[PDB]
């Protein structure tokens, strides 16, 4: 499912997840998975 992981130890996990998913607000970190909308 995931675009990439979300690691809480990476304080920029939400920005990286957005980058994976195409830009601002497009990715959500839901537990250990970055999921694209």
Overall resolution, Å: 1.1
CA 17-18-21 angle, to 5 degrees, is 90
Q: Which technique was used to obtain these atomic coordinates?
A: X-ray
Domain limits for position 27: 4-36
Q: How many domains does the chain have?
A: 1
- Here the tokens at position 21 are 């998913």
CA dihedral 14, 19, 20, 23 (to 10 degrees): 100
Determine contact, residues 26/35, Cβ cutoff 8 Å.
Answer: no
Q: Find, among 29, 25, 24, 31, the residue nearest to 3 by Cα.
A: 29
Structure tokens at 28: 């959500």
Q: What is the DSSP string of 1-37?
A: --SEE--TTSTTHHHHHHHHHTSTT-EEEETTEEEE-
Q: State the burial class of residue 6 (Cβ atoms within 10 Å of its Cβ: 0-12, 13-18, 19+).
A: buried
**Angle at Cα 13 formed by Cα 24 and Cα 11, nearest 5°?**
120
């Amino acid at each position: 499912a995931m675009c990439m992981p979300c690691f809480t130890t990476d304080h920029q996990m939400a920005r990286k997840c957005d980058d994976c998913c195409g830009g601002k607000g497009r990715g959500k970190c839901y537990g250990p998975q970055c999921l694209c909308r």
